Enzyme design. Sequence first.
Site, mmCIF file in Angstrom:
data_model
loop_
_atom_site.group_PDB
_atom_site.id
_atom_site.type_symbol
_atom_site.label_atom_id
_atom_site.label_comp_id
_atom_site.label_asym_id
_atom_site.label_seq_id
_atom_site.Cartn_x
_atom_site.Cartn_y
_atom_site.Cartn_z
ATOM 1 N N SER A 52 0.649 -1.405 -0.290
ATOM 2 C CA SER A 52 0.115 0.033 -0.042
ATOM 3 C C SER A 52 0.762 1.411 0.033
ATOM 4 O O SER A 52 2.133 0.976 0.493
ATOM 5 C CB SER A 52 -1.482 0.363 1.001
ATOM 6 O OG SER A 52 -0.355 0.299 2.458
ATOM 7 N N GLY B 295 3.105 -8.729 3.565
ATOM 8 C CA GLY B 295 2.550 -8.350 2.373
ATOM 9 C C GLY B 295 2.669 -6.732 2.679
ATOM 10 O O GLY B 295 2.728 -6.450 1.263
ATOM 11 N N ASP B 296 2.790 -6.313 3.548
ATOM 12 C CA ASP B 296 3.281 -4.577 3.148
ATOM 13 C C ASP B 296 3.544 -4.052 4.924
ATOM 14 O O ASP B 296 3.396 -3.127 5.147
ATOM 15 C CB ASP B 296 1.490 -4.351 3.742
ATOM 16 C CG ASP B 296 1.339 -2.611 2.895
ATOM 17 O OD1 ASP B 296 2.265 -2.201 2.234
ATOM 18 O OD2 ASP B 296 0.743 -1.756 3.729
ATOM 19 N N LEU B 297 4.976 -4.541 5.011
ATOM 20 C CA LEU B 297 5.341 -4.299 5.696
ATOM 21 C C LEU B 297 6.721 -2.790 5.386
ATOM 22 O O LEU B 297 7.931 -2.565 5.721
ATOM 23 C CB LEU B 297 6.970 -5.388 6.290
ATOM 24 C CG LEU B 297 7.620 -5.414 7.111
ATOM 25 C CD1 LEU B 297 6.344 -5.576 8.145
ATOM 26 C CD2 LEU B 297 8.916 -6.832 7.467
#
Lengths: 6, 282
Positions: free
Chosen positions: A6, B184-186
Amino acid sequence: KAXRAS
Amino acid sequence: TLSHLVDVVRRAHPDVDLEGAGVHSGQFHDVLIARDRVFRFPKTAGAAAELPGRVAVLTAVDAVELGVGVPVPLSEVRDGGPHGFLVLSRLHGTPLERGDATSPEVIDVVAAEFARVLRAMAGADVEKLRLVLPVADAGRWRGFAGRVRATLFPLMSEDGRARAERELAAAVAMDHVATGLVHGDLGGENVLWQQVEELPRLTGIVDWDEAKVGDPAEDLAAVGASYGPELVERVVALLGAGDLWPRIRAYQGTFALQQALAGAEDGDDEELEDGLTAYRKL
């Protein structure tokens, strides 16, 4: 969100 | 109505101050933040299924024993409120600013904090994880490429599309790896630190929404995006993961396009704009 994902 | 939710919480948990209490909202979930506790209230009866989903992911991640905190269900899922609610622990600590993380006196400590977590994630019992978590799919980047070409390519310059085609291809070219736990989003915003006797300690990792059995290179890519190659080189050196650099760069080259595609799909204009800036002139 955002550039890392993101 | 947040009024009802407030009464739901006070009734179920009398001693919890909701004055000066955070609120995140979306057409799916309401979340009340407090000192030590988070209350999640789904809005539809379908979105209710997120609650046992979140419990299952967080319990499986906890069971790996990362050596740092992750959010803990503090309650069973309750069928109170409109469509249920779940109480989670609130982790303390602050993201490390890029400036702080890279100072010569702390860089080695920061590198080992990331390394010991990533090492524990790579050593997870994958047979156990594969029953609970999403598993990296060999078709993922093929499909992602399709949706970028369909949705974003028209908005790009010709140079944009050329750059995007090379970045999509580097990801599509990667052989399938599903060997450990991947956050997955570190990025830095999801990693929480405290000054412990005047040196950083990685105390918490939050936002396990993208958690999967996958490629360790994906988390190293995200650390790189937040902190730069000086830090990730030291993490990789410690892990002995010098083999992974091509995969790390392949993930990192998709990050702007991931953000742009999500901005389009989520209808966030500023994310779409920010994601696309390298892929056009105006």
